[PDB]
Amino acid sequence: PEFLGEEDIPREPRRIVIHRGSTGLGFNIVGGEDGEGIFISFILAGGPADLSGELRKGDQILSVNGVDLRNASHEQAAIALKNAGQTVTIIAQYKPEEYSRFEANSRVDSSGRIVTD
């Protein structure tokens, strides 16, 4: 029995293309205060982000269509994503410890997964 859970989630940056289609992009973000960063907090089942299969809760969004968002405000990230067109190219990086600061009663387990009590 070879569980995925027991193997580390890659920590290096990745490139993900989402296809907006006829809905939103299917995820929510938190953060954006004073350069703390923009993090994915929720991925909607069946939505474009989910259909991509390459994003997760705890990913920081480093850029949208080449536009740097590491230090962007929440409103700025939202605007950029809204305007990024049909084909949205995201650079993302999994940062669960940093993400876990934002979600109440959450922490990172020894496998690097985000847990919430």
- Whether residue 23 contacts residue 48, with contact meaning beta carbons closer than 8 Å, is answered with yes
Calpha distance 9→114 (Å, rounded): 11
Q: Estimate the share of the chain in helix, then strand, then coil, as percent rounded to the nearest 5.
A: 20, 35, 50
Calpha distance 47→20 (Å, rounded): 9
Residue 16 belongs to what domain range?
Answer: 1-117
Q: How many residues are there in the chain?
A: 117
Helix, strand or coil, per DSSP, at residue 31? strand
Resolution of this deposited model, Å: 1.8
CATH code (residue 18) = 2.30.42.10
Q: How many domains does the chain have?
A: 1
Q: How was this structure determined?
A: X-ray
